[PDB]
Structure formats: C-alpha cells, structure tokens
Amino acid sequence: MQLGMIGLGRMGANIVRRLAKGGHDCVVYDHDPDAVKAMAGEDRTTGVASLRELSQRLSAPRVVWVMVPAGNITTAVIEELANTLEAGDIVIDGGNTYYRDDLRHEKLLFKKGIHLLDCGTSGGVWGRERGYCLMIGGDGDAFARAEPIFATVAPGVAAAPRTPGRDGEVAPSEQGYLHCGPCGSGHFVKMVHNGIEYGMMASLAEGLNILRNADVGTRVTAPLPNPECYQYDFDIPEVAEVWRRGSVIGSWLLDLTAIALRESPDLAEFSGRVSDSGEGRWTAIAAIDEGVPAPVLTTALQSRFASRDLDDFANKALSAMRKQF
Amino acid sequence: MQLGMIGLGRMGANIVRRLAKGGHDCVVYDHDPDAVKAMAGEDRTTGVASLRELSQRLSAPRVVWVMVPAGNITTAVIEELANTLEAGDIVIDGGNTYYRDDLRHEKLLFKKGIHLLDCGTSGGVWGRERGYCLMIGGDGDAFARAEPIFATVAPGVAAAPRTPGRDGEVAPSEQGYLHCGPCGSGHFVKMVHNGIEYGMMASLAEGLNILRNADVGTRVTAPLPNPECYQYDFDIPEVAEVWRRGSVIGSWLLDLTAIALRESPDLAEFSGRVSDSGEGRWTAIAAIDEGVPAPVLTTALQSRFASRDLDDFANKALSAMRKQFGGHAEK
Amino acid sequence: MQLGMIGLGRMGANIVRRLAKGGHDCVVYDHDPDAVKAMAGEDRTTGVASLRELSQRLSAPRVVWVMVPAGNITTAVIEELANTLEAGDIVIDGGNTYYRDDLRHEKLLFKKGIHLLDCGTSGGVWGRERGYCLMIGGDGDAFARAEPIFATVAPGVAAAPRTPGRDGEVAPSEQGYLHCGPCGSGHFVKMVHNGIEYGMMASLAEGLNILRNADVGTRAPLPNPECYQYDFDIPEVAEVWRRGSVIGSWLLDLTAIALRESPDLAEFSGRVSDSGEGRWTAIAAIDEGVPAPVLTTALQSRFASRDLDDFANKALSAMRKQF
Amino acid sequence: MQLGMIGLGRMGANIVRRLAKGGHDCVVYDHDPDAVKAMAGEDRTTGVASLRELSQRLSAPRVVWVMVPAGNITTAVIEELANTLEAGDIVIDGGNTYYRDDLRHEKLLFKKGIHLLDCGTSGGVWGRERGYCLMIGGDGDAFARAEPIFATVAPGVAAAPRTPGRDGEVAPSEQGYLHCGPCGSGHFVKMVHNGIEYGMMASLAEGLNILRNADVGTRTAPLPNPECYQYDFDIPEVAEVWRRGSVIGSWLLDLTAIALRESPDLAEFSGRVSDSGEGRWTAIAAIDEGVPAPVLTTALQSRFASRDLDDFANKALSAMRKQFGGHAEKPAN
C-alpha cells in the first residue's frame, strides 16, 4: 500500500524506513532537499520535488502524512495541501500540533472532500526498530483506509506480552495504534501521554536526587537536626539497576536512566536546562479547564520551568522582601 | 546454606519457600503455632516454639531473618535475639523498618557482637515466583557471609534483559540485590523506591482522570471558556492498552493499570480513599532535610491525605474566609 | 456626574450607594422589578425597566457600569448596549469577565465607536463602606472622563498610611484605583489578584490545619507520639497573629472573626467553589512559562475538595489491588 | 518588675529597650564587649559579663530571657543557667529553638526546680517601636508570673482594631501574646507562623512573575493566541493599588510595594533564596500529621530550586530526554 510524507527529520524519515521494510510503497519529500535524496536510495522509496508530484505519484484515495515542526509551518502546508489534493484524499498529521489547531485545518480540508487524521506519534530515536505508538483521530473510513500504514509503523503486539485478561482476538491497541475518536482526539491523547511522561521522569529524578544528597550529614539553609541519619554515599548507577528486576517502578524510563548512569555516573554532559515542547502545558491547561486536580503532572512541568530560570522575578521578589524585615 | 526465619505472614512464609526450594535449610518460628505448623511438611523446613530452641538448632555463625509487623514488634524480637544468639551471628531485618530505627538496632546488637543486616524487601506476593528486589545495608563481611540468601530470594539477572552498557560478567545489582552501604542504607533506598511508586501511580491516575473529563463540554462554578474543545468520550482502557508498547510511559504499573481497566472500564467498584505506608512520608521528610525539591513525590503523598478527608479544616477555613469577604455560599 | 448601572446584586447595588453618598446620579436596572424597586427609593437612584429608557435618561457623553454574572449573560447585555448607545459612550465592565472576552467585547463596540473600560472590581461585601480596589483597562481618555467615578468607589489614600518614599502628590494607585493599560489589562490584573488571594488563603488554611492535628499522638505509624500532644486554641492563635507578626493580613482578620463565631468552622462543609480567575491565572502562568506551584496547588486543593480527584483515587486503588 | 536578658543581637537588645520604657529593671549580657557596653548606658539597664554576676544582680524569684542563636549555643546557656539560677526562678527562651529541644531543656531545668517558658518571637526590626507577637508555652503559673514581661514587649490591643465579636474586656490574644499550651507549644505555633510566611511570600512572588511576563506575546513551546499576552504592566503601581480596598491587603504587600518603589525590576537582587528551618519543620509536622500542605511545602521547595539543589534531578530529566527522543539541551540564553 502507498503513502505520502512531507517533512523528513529524526522522525518523519525513520517512519518511512519501517514503512518500506514492512512492505509499503512510500513517496517522500521535504523543503530542504537533502532528506529527499538519501531516502529515495532505499527499498520502495522515491523522492518527488513538490506536493503535486506526490498526489499524482499516489493512488486515489490518497494518504498524505505531515511530520513538519508545529505552529505556522504546519498551517501553511495544510492550506497548500488544500489546493494540491482532491476528494477521498485523507491527510495524516503526525507532528506535535495542538489538538485545537487540527479543528480549523480539518474544516479547511472537509470543505474540498480532503480528510484529516490527527496522529499522536511517540517512540523517538527508538521508533524505527521498536515501533512508533500512534493515536489517530478523525473519520472512521479515512482511518480504515490507512490502517495498513499505521500497523506497519506501530511496534506490533509482539513488542510485549498480551494483557492478562484479553482472551479472544487481538485489537488495534494491542499492536500499538488506535482510532482515539474524532478531530483533535488523536493529538489530545499524545498531550496526556506527555503529561504522564513528565510526571513519571520527575518521580524517578526527584528520588535519585534524594539518594545523591543522602550524605548531607557528612557535607556540613536550616541547621540539620540528626546529621547521623544522613551519612550515606549511594552507588546511584547500581540502585538504578537493582530496581530493574523484582520491584514496582520497573519502566522503560528506568531502563534508559540505568543506561545514562552506566555511561555517565554523575550525568556531567547535561547542564540542567530542561525544555518543554508545549504538550505538558496543554495537559496542565486541559486539567484546569476540566477541574481535574493534577498537582503531580503540573508540578513536574513547573520544575522544568524553574530549571530554565523562569522563576527569576519571583526569586528577586522573595529576596527584596526578606531585606525589608 | 542454613537460615532462620521469625514471622510467617504472607511475606515471611514465601521467602522460606523461595529459599528452601532453591536449596537452603530453613528453621522457622512464629507467635502462631498453626502458622509454624504450615512450614513443617515443606521440604528442607522445620518449626520451633522458642527463640533459644531456634539458635540451638542453627550452626554458629547463625543468620536469622525477621519478617514481622514494623515498629515495637520488630524491636521486641531483636531485643531477645540479643539473648539467644552469640557473637559473630547476623540478624536480617527484612521488615518495613524506619532506617533511623535500624541505627538503634545496630548498636543494641554490636553490644553482644551481633551484626544487623537491614534488607529492604519489595515486589509484593509476585516475588515468590518472580523474586523480591532486595536492598541490603550494614557490615560488608556480614553481607558477604549472608549473601547466598539475598542472591536466592532475588529475582536474578534472567528476569530482565541486561543493560546496554554492561560489558562482561554479572554484578550483584543485575541479580536484583545490592549492598547499598552501611547500616540502614537498604531501608533508605527502599523508602525512596516507594516515594517513586507514589509518583508514577499519581502521574498515570491524574493522566487517566484528564481523559475521563475531556467530555466536560457535553454536560453544563467556573464558566468553562471554549467548551467545544472538550467534547471527547475517550476509550480509557484501550488508550491505557495502546501506550503499553511504542510509548515512553511503558511500566509494570501501566501494565496493571491496563489489566485493572479491562476488568472494570469506569473503576466503579473501587474505594476513592487511598491509604499511605509511611515509607512515602519518610521519603518526603528525607527530601526536606537534604534541601531536595520533591514537589512531584510530596504532592502525590498529600493527594493521598486529601482522599481520606485529612484536608477538611483547611477546606472549612477557605469556605469561612470566602463567606466573610464575598458572601460566598457552598454549593 | 451621571452614570449607568446594569446588575444590582451584593456588588453593583453597594457600588451605587457608595457612588450616591459621593454625589453621583445613578440609573439602576436588573431583570427583577423588586431589585429596581428598593433602589428607586435610595438617594440619586432612578428605577427604569428598559435599557433604552436607561440610555435616554443619560446626558451624552454617557458612561454605563455592567455588573452582571460573567459569560453569556455579560455578552448579552453588551451586544444589546451597542444598539442602546451611539458614539462617545463609555461601557464600564466591572464584573468578573475573562480578559480574553474583553477583547471581543471591545472590537464589537469599536463598530459603533463605544469605548470599553474593563474594570477589575475588588473588595467584596465590605465595599459600600471600606471602598473597592479597582484595576481598569482600555482608552487613556475614556478612563480620563470616567476617572471621578473610579475615585468615588475606590477607598481613597486615607485607607492606609502612604508607602515610605511616596513623596508629593497622591497618585491614582494610592487612592485604591489604577489604569493598568489597554483593554483587558484591568480584568487581567484582577484575575492575578485572585490567584494571589487563593495562595494567601490556602497558606493560612493549611497552617491552621497543621495546628489542629498537632494533638495527633493522643489518638503509617507515628515515630515520637510525645512530639504531637498539643491541643492549640485555633481562635486565639488566629487573633495573636494580628498584632506584631509577619503574617498580618485582611484574610487573617476575617479568619479571626469566623473562628470567634464558630471555633470548629462546623457550619462549613469544605466543598469550596472556584469562580474562574484562579484557573485563568494558572493558564496565564503555564502559557508564559512562569512556574506557579504555590498558586496552582492552591486551586488544585479546591478541585480536590469537590471530589474531582475521584476517578484518580479509583485508579490508584485499582493499581494497589494487584502489586 | 525586674528581668534578666542573655544575648543582645537585633532582637535581644530591642526587648530590653521596649521593657525599660515600659518601666522594668533590665540586667543584660552577650560575650562581645562592645555589645554589653552599648546596652549599659540606657534606662534601668546594667551591662555585666558573668552569668553568676547576673543572678546576683537579680532578686529571687527571677525571670531571665535568652536570645542567643538556636542549637548548640542556646543549649550551652540553658545547661549553665541550671547552676547559676535557683528553684522557683523562670527561663524565657525566645530564640528560634526547635520545639523538640524545649522538651529536653524543660527536663534539665526541672531537675533544678527552675521553670522553662518557651517564647515564639516574631515581628522583625520594626518590633522595637511596634512590638513583637509572642507565642508562649510552659507551666500555667510560670506564665501568670512572667505575663507582665510578655504584655509589655507585645504591641498591645491599640495596634489594630478589636476583632468584631470580641466582647468586653481585652483578652491576651488581643494584646499580641498567648499562652499556647504546655512546653514547646509556643515555638511550634511560631514554626507554623513561619511556614505561612513562606506561603504568603511565594503567592505574592508567583503573581508578580505572572504580571512580569504578560508581555511574552511580543517577545521551545509555540504560544497559542499571543495577541492575548501583550501587556507591559507597572508592577510597582499594581503592588501599591492592591494595598487599599482589596482582599490581599497584608504587611508583606506593604513591604513588596516599598521594595518595588525603591527598585522596580528588582534587578540588583540575587534570586538565590535562603530558608531558616522553621519552614522545614512546618512541612515535616504536616507530613507526620497526615495534613496535606502542598501550598506551604511547594513555597519551601521553590527556595531549594532557587539554590540549584534540583541540579541532579534536572540532569536526570535531560539524561532521560536525550535517550528516548535525542532531545537537545538548548544553550544558556
């Protein structure tokens, strides 16, 4: 089965590799023409030179998948794609778009019979040999047409045991992809996956910090009562490892964290300045609009904010106040 | 090798059954003879009826494991194990003891030459099959002598693929045990293990709730701006399922969360009040003394408190303030 | 001078009665006739039953205060104030309008040349006497005209000793009112006033809660039950904190009242509403990358007090029921 | 009546001075020579430099106030006062002592017949003119005996209007001093008083920072609707406006107003914030008691990050963020 791909980075590319390698004709493209050549020289991949050439080098109805950076670069492509496509022609979007962005786009497209499918792509610099968890939202037939594509790019049921409970047969979710519901729905679930990520990383991270500083009763701000109760130097890299078998906080993020600490035992190569792509933020904003109390996820987000010195004016404020006493 | 076990509840019973089956001689004891009785028929196992009999039927040096209710039961046992065992003997506290409490137990035992190993014992009841992630603190030699036990209850390297970065032979951590350091350091890492568990769980929970209520535009206090954006009926169980492979948030908790949501889509039959160990509190008290920002871990802990209504006077003070300045009624 | 007024609840009515005693003419109206009845008797207060009767009663250029429930009911009165007014007419929105909806309300009255003064009104149900702290936005010159209103409902400088370093002439700020900037800027500052108000309330509430359970030893095992044997008299700590302490505040003063009436705050359920300004502040904060754990945590505590954690508590229970 | 003082920092002194004017006989001391000179040339004072000389210069039964640094030093001085004083006497520890320590100090001092009164003292430097909020614990009768000291060094009912509902005659509460209960009760309340301080300061600061950055729609995460965030607010004037007829009227607003008046970008100030320890204890009492205190505890945890104590954790996130999504740590602006 045949596909389009606008935008080719660390992701939009490694998509098309396990698309070909599975058994799919893929027809790639980009803005900076470097990415379109390297791909075109591998199994079942051809690098066109415009959005029109791609639609013409595909089967009607046409699947066309956009993994370009989010914001106004996404919007221009979708209002270009509008003129360069026809009816029956579904339009997957697997970049980090705000579920609400999708609402205006899918109206501009559902005008000219062009369909949108909001895709929640995750997996990263593993998603090629491990598969890319997708959370697709839109029309039920448009979805069904592409379902081939999605299975090829998911990790597949094999990736982990089936659910102690699922007797009978084996549904989308099990392999690693899901019609989440209508327009937005796709990206919405990706937001919250990211919410939980921040939360889950922060939990490990806070606990590891706790351990790292267990020795504060040797390293001698309040006057510490009971410095004998803080005399421990913890092999943080081994503690990370030990928790990998037979405990509860078993997780992919500890596996990576057990790596990163095997390589770099004091994570020196990282400064502290933690960026946030914006999906943490829209999860937090969702919670506040829904009246869902989410202090754990929203406080993981606020810790990143603080790690980039965005607490600055509040900190001057507190300093300026203490002086006045 | 040969071993003693005081306390035969679910946990202490299953350790002996992992140990005996893995070729270890296990002398058992409990307060409850019928409980002692259960571990007589079992291969390589043997009941007693006092702490002196125990140490007469155990070759010097002895290694006695204590798996009993934490606090003044752990203490009282250890206090007689000081009159029962001789010099050079070792006591394993696998219990859920406060590391600060191990600092008192260490000194009260080395005043009759008895080494105190503190073992932090995780896993649950799966641990009899899969093994118990262990965390052991105290004497480097006492550990070394007693290590064949820890290796045996441990899940073992087989349990998870080796870490990309571990070139060569198989280190103690990879078995699922570790000499974490001096006395108390096993219970300490164990504490923080639980803190993390509270954080990871809360992160999923809050997450699932944010899906649960995406439908908040459908039903219609704060005037929800742009309600049309919140009009989804999410299949939470499938969403939990799909994340299981190809996501970043893949975990044993997410697995259980997917099982739990399969059997009961809306968790309709479940409690709503969430209790807390105390390891979760200790972690938060640790983090404050060291000057470690632990907003995520602590706020998971205090979420638990708020679910047992423990935030109620605070709530009454907010409502009281509100009436004063705004004439605001409660709905 | 001469002023409109649409909505006569515990605020807008008590605004009028303050506006009056400082020699202003007021043209009241609210759905309920009985609402517009009571007022019609009070000084300089005129009981119409039509928006058009209202705008005919006013000597151009007009200025009309809108104090109605936020959301649709606010939009409804503003749309219909477009056709009820001409040009050079100022619309003072003193209700609890999301600043984003102020922008929409402004363009929609810039299409009849009607100035919007979005005014963040503070002070609650003490404001008839004590005055209302006010945070206005939109046009420098529309503000300029309405100014002598805004000083009347405000508390005036005399409400509190001048800031050390405040030399010379009493500024708008010091009188208890201020022009914050363009449209919205008024309701945006007020929004943030409420975010801070949530955090100050919660700071005291959580503190009182710690004292109330400091007797915890006399009833997750507690190490050292001898350290938790104090039965604090919360009414009296509240009152001692009023004089000579860092934490003196109006909210401490009101807390102190409430504990003198009700020492266990028995008549309050603890199910605590939030009216939207706390939420909009926390969204403003997330969008600007400003870390606000202390404010947002305080909001999340009101949600939890209404069982809005219920599904998550269920998830955690269901998880525990396995491992 | 007549009163001993040990320790003469920014606090020890200003109680002496306030009492003398209130008409009490002060006897003083603090190691440093010049500090004992400075107090000896004022009304009803008497700068000594033995502790034995001080208990001579005082008449039994006596009242000594202690205002030396918390921990080692304050315990040192209580041990030594166990010899120096005699039965029926009274110790006022007004230091930033931990309530758990007052319970040891009350045992020691009882095994020589003396009474401890623990006094939680607030106010700051303004308390010489204005007075100090005292929160006192200890033996009911030793309070009655020392009450006149407390009543003098407190601001008195005159400092604020009477609470509506307070009938009739002035309760001590209303003076700004309170017997909070038995030994420690006083320091404990002061402890929580400080937690609340952290909570109110954070709430003002986070607010100021939201105002500060309302301009972000003119100046990573893509910002939806940046037409929304185009405000350049006057933080010094908003701080000032809020002081009259609002809900967040407080001292700390008053101070923040002054600070922003002197310095409207707080540009000279560090943005590394200390905590003293009452805040840490308040957070730990709350955890011990199953009292959810996320607002106080986060105000606390916001100072720790302000001192790069979130360092390792941040590295862990950047370590995680790399491994999964080859995410790049963006440079230091």
Q: Where are the alpha helices (DSSP H) in chain C?
A: 12-21, 33-41, 51-56, 72-82, 99-110, 127-130, 140-153, 172-175, 185-212, 234-240, 250-261, 277-287, 293-304, 310-320
D25 and D137 within one domain: yes
Identify residues after which chain A is interrupted (C–N over 2.5 A): 220
B230 and B133 within one domain: no
Q: Where are the alpha helices (DSSP H) in chain A?
A: 12-23, 35-40, 51-56, 72-81, 99-111, 140-153, 172-175, 185-212, 236-242, 252-263, 279-290, 295-307, 312-324
Q: Where are the alpha helices (DSSP H) in B180-311?
A: 185-212, 236-242, 252-263, 279-289, 295-307
CA B268 to chain centre: 27
CB C134 within 8 A of CB C154: yes
B·D CB contacts under 8 A: 61
d(C-alpha A78, C-alpha A72), whole Å: 10
Q: Domain end: A168, A183, A198, which one?
A: A183
d(C-alpha C170, C-alpha B296), whole Å: 46
d(C-alpha B179, C-alpha A224), whole Å: 27
H/E element, B135: strand B134-137
Question: In this structure, is residue C97 part of a structural domain?
Answer: yes
B165 and B71 within one domain: yes
d(C-alpha C259, C-alpha D165), whole Å: 10
CB D252 within 8 A of CB A321: yes
CATH code of residue D269: 1.10.1040.10
Q: Which of residues 184-223 of D touch A (CB under 8 A)?
A: 201-202, 204-206, 208-209, 212-213, 220-222
CATH code of residue D145: 3.40.50.720
C98 and C9 within one domain: yes
Q: Is A51 helix (H, G, I), strand (E, B) or coil?
A: helix
C208 and C110 within one domain: no
Q: Is C61 helix (H, G, I), strand (E, B) or coil?
A: coil
CA B88 to chain centre: 29
Structural domain containing residue B73: 2-181
CA distances in angstroms from B120 to B99, B140, B168, B183, listed in the order given? 10, 16, 28, 12
Question: In this structure, is residue D102 part of a structural domain?
Answer: yes
Quickly count: other Cβ atoms within 10 Å of residue C245's Cβ: 26
Q: Which of residues 240-259 of B touch D (CB under 8 A)?
A: 248
Most B-contacting residue of D301, D302, D322 (CB-CB within 10 A), to test interface:
D301
Question: In this structure, is residue D160 part of a structural domain?
Answer: yes
Q: Residues, chain C, total?
A: 323
User: Is A175 an interface residue toward D (CB < 8 Å)?
Assistant: no
Question: In this structure, is residue C128 part of a structural domain?
Answer: yes
Tokens of C64: 């009309």
Q: Domain end: B138, B160, B181, which one?
A: B181
User: Is D304 an interface residue toward B (CB < 8 Å)?
Assistant: yes
B126 and B61 within one domain: yes
Question: In this structure, is residue B210 part of a structural domain?
Answer: yes
Question: What's the gap in Å between the CA of C159 and the closest CA on chain D?
Answer: 6
d(C-alpha A258, C-alpha A265), whole Å: 10
B27 and B163 within one domain: yes
Most B-contacting residue of A100, A125, A170, A173 (CB-CB within 10 A), to test interface:
A173
Residue of chain A whose Cα is closest to the Cα of B133 = A246
| In the block, residue with structure tokens 């009624």 | B329
Question: In this structure, is residue D178 part of a structural domain?
Answer: yes
What domain count does chain B have?
2
D51 and D165 within one domain: yes
CB D154 within 8 A of CB D173: no
Report CB contact under 8 Å: C246, D197. Answer: yes
CB B6 within 8 A of CB B68: yes
Which sequence positions of D are flagged as catalytic?
Answer: 190, 197
Q: Which residues pair with A116 in a beta bridge?
A: A91
DSSP type of residue C163: P
C72 and C30 within one domain: yes
B154 and B121 within one domain: yes
Shortest CB distance from A293 goes to which of C287, C292, C304? C304
Which sequence positions of B are flagged as catalytic?
Answer: 190, 197
CB B328 within 8 A of CB C273: yes
Q: What subunits make at least 3 CB pairs under 8 angstroms with C? A: A, B, D
B193 and B84 within one domain: no
Question: What's the gap in Å between the CA of B254 and the closest CA on chain D?
Answer: 18
Method: X-ray
Q: Domain end: D183, D211, D228, which one?
A: D183
Most C-contacting residue of A249, A288, A303 (CB-CB within 10 A), to test interface:
A288
Report CB contact under 8 Å: B250, A245. Answer: no
- Which residues lie below 8 Å from residue D38, measured CB to CB, with a gap of 6+? D8, D13, D47
DSSP string covering C280-292 = HHHHHHHHTT---
Resolution of the coordinates in A?
2.7
| In the block, residue with structure tokens 């009768």 | D141
CB B314 within 8 A of CB D326: no
| Chain A residue numbers touching D294 (CB-CB < 8 A) | 295
Question: In this structure, is residue D317 part of a structural domain?
Answer: no
D228 and D245 within one domain: yes
Question: In this structure, is residue B247 part of a structural domain?
Answer: no
Tokens of C301: 């505590």
Please list, residue by residue across A31-56, b when 16 or more beta carbons sit within 10 angstroms of its beta carbon and e when fewer do: eeeebbeebeeeeebebbeebeebbe
Q: Which residues pair with A45 in a beta bridge?
A: A26
Tokens of C29: 């109206």
